[PDB]
Design a protein around this ligand. Structure first.
Ligand SMILES: *[C@@H]1O[C@H](CO)[C@@H](O[C@@H]2O[C@H](CO)[C@@H](O)[C@H](O)[C@H]2NC(C)=O)[C@H](O[C@@H]2O[C@@H](C)[C@@H](O)[C@@H](O)[C@@H]2O)[C@H]1NC(C)=O
Ligand SMILES: *[C@@H]1O[C@H](CO)[C@@H](O[C@@H]2O[C@H](CO)[C@@H](O)[C@H](O)[C@H]2NC(C)=O)[C@H](O[C@@H]2O[C@@H](C)[C@@H](O)[C@@H](O)[C@@H]2O)[C@H]1NC(C)=O
Ligand SMILES: *[C@@H]1O[C@H](CO)[C@@H](O[C@@H]2O[C@H](CO)[C@@H](O)[C@H](O)[C@H]2NC(C)=O)[C@H](O[C@@H]2O[C@@H](C)[C@@H](O)[C@@H](O)[C@@H]2O)[C@H]1NC(C)=O
Ligand SMILES: *[C@@H]1O[C@H](CO)[C@@H](O)[C@H](O[C@@H]2O[C@@H](C)[C@@H](O)[C@@H](O)[C@@H]2O)[C@H]1NC(C)=O
Ligand SMILES: [Ca+2]
Ligand SMILES: [Ca+2]
Ligand SMILES: [Mn+2]
Ligand SMILES: [Mn+2]
Lengths: 237, 237
C-alpha cells in the first residue's frame, strides 16, 4: 500500500490541504504559514497546513511500519535582524484531527494542557531557554527539546531544499537541508521508532510561528513560506 | 583527539597522499583515479588514493569510537553511453598497508584471494550480477554486495558534492549526494558498527575502476576524478 502526492505550487482553495490559524495561500502560489501584511511579516502569528487525508504509518495487525520520503522547498525571509527573528517552522507528524497548539517557541504543535504525540523536524530561528545556538535543524519527538541538533546558516530570503527520509527497517530518520544559492549542505539523522510514539493513522504537514507577544518585541518575526511539497509513503504490511 | 585535513586542490607529488596503480594527479590539479589518455578514459584501469597517515577510528582501552565527517567532489564523465560505462568509484576505510584488490565491479577494494575488512560508500555505474539497477549509491561492509542501496541519475561530466557523516553515538552512517547543476539530492543511511568490523587504526581514501577486459568491451569506461576533499574525525577517547 503506497500513497503519494506532489504540489509543484499551491492554489488558493486547495481541497487537498487543510489550513489552520493564520496559514494562507498567496495569489502567487506560495503557502504562507505565518501572517504577512503588505509584504511585511508580523509577530504573534501561528499557522499550520496539513494534508487533508490521514496516512497510515503502521499496522497493528502485522506490526509493520511505513517507510516514507518527503521533499519540500521553503523560504524564510528575515526583514528585521537587530532584535531577533522568530520563531521557525517544522514539518511534523501527529495524530489526526489535532488543533494548533502554543505559538512562539512551540511552533504551534505543542499543547501543554493536552499534549498529543508527534515527530517533527524543526528549522529553529530563535534561541529559547532550551535551545543550543540558532539557527539549527532539530529532530523532535513529543517535545520541542530536540533529541539531536545541527546548526546551519540561513540564506535570508533565499530558497532551501529539504529531503526527509525515514527507513522502517533501520528506524533511521535522515534529513538534508540544501541552500542552492550558497552551495551549502547540512545533514542530521537519528533513530526514531514511529510505532512507539504514534498511532496507526496520522496527519503530515507544516507549522510555523512568529514572535509571541510575551516577548514584547514586534520585530521578532520572519516569513515561513513553503514553495513546493511532495510526499511518498510505502506500507508493505 | 581530533584530526582533520583538507585538500582544496591536489598538487602533483602530494606528500600527503599515497597513490596506487593508475591513480594520478593531473597538471590542472585533479586526482584521476583511473587512466585517462589524451582526455579519453580507458578500460582495464584501477587506482586508489589513500591519506598517507593512518587515523584512529576507535580505541580498545576506553572502547570509544570516533565520529567523523568527510566531504568531497567528484566527476564521472561517460564518453561512451552505448555499451555500458564501468565501473564506478568508492570512498573507503580499510586497515593500513593494504594493496589494490581486484578491478571491475570490485572497485579495487576487494581481494578474493585474501579479503581484508572495509567499510565503503560506492557510486556504482555498472550492473554486476549482485547489483540492483545502476547507477546507485551503496553502503558496503566487507563486500561489494551493498547492505543498502539507492538509485541516482548521474550528471554526465558534471560536478557532484558528497557528504559522508558517521555519528558514533547512534552508529548511523549517512551519505548525501548532490548535483548542483541539476539541483538533485540523493540520500542514504544505514547502521554500521565500526568497532565490530575494523581495527583501531585505518586508512581513508578512494578507489575506482573502469571496465574489466573479461567483459570484452572497450567502451566500458568513464573518468573517476576527485576535485577536492576534506576529512574530520573526533575520537573522544
Ligand atoms: C525593528 O526594526 C527596525 C527596522 O529594521 C529598526 O529600525 C531601524 O534601525 C536602524 C538602526 O538600528 C536604522 O538605521 C533604520 O533606519 C531603522 N529603520 C526603520 C524603518 O526604523 C528598529 O530599531 C529601533 O528603532 C530605530 C528607529 C532606532 O531607534 C534603533 O536604535 C532601535 O533599536 C527595530 N526595533 C528594535 C526593537 O530593535
Ligand atoms: C590490462 O592492464 C594490465 C596492466 O596491469 C596489462 O598487463 C600486462 O602484464 C604484463 C605482465 O608483467 C606486463 O609486462 C605488461 O606491461 C602489462 N600490459 C602491458 C602494458 O603490456 C594487460 O595486458 C594484457 O595482458 C598481458 C599479460 C599481456 O598479454 C598484454 O599483451 C595484454 O595486453 C591489460 N589487458 C589488456 C587486454 O589490455
Ligand atoms: C563504442 O563507443 C563508440 C563511441 O560512441 C561507438 O561508435 C560510434 O557509434 C555511433 C553509432 O553507434 C556512430 O554514430 C559513431 O560515428 C561512432 N563513433 C566512433 C568514433 O566509432 C561504438 O558503436 C559501435 O561501433 C562503431 C564503430 C559503429 O560501428 C557503431 O555503429 C556501433 O554501434 C561503441 N561500440 C559498442 C560496443 O557499442
Ligand atoms: C495575538 O493574536 C491573538 C489571536 O490571533 C489576538 O487575539 C490578540 O489580539 C488582541 O489582543 C490580545 C492581547 C487579546 O486581548 C486578544 O483577545 C485580542 O484580539 C493578539 N495580541 C496582540 C499582541 O496583538
Ligand atoms: Ca526555539
Ligand atoms: Ca557494480
Ligand atoms: Mn530548537
Ligand atoms: Mn553496487
Amino acid at each position: 500500500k503506497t500513497i503519494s502526492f506532489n504540489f509543484n505550487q499551491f492554489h488558493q482553495n486547495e481541497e487537498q490541504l487543510k489550513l489552520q490559524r493564520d496559514a494562507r495561500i498567496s495569489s502567487n502560489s506560495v503557502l504562507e504559514l505565518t501572517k504577512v501584511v503588505n509584504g511585511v511579516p508580523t509577530w504573534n502569528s501561528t499557522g499550520r497546513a496539513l494534508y487533508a487525508k490521514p496516512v497510515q504509518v503502521w499496522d497493528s495487525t502485522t506490526g509493520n511500519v511505513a517507510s516514507f520520503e518527503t521533499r519540500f522547498s521553503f523560504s524564510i525571509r528575515q526583514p528585521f535582524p537587530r532584535p531577533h527573528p522568530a520563531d521557525g517552522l517544522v514539518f511534523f507528524i501527529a495524530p489526526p484531527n489535532t488543533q494548533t497548539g502554543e505559538g512562539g517557541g512551540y511552533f504551534g504543535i505543542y499543547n501543554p494542557l493536552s499534549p498529543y504525540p508527534f515527530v517533527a523536524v524543526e528549522f529553529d530561528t530563535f534561541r529559547n531557554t532550551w535551545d543550543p545556538q540558532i539557527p539549527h535543524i532539530g529532530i523532535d519527538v513529543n517535545s520541542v527539546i530536540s533529541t539531536k541538533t545541527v546548526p546551519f546558516t540561513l540564506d535570508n530570503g533565499g530558497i532551501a531544499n529539504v529531503v526527509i527520509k525515514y527507513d522502517a527497517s533501520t528506524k533511521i530518520l535522515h534529513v538534508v537541508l540544501v541552500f542552492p544559492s550558497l552551495g551549502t549542505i547540512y545533514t542530521i539523522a537519528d533513530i526514531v521508532d514511529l510505532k512507539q510514539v504514534l498511532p496507526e493513522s496520522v496527519n503530515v504537514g507544516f507549522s510555523a510561528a512568529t514572535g509571541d507577544p510575551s516577548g514584547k518585541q514586534r520585530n521578532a518575526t520572519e516569513t515561513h513560506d513553503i514553495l513546493s511539497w511532495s510526499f511518498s509513503a510505502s506500507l508493505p504490511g
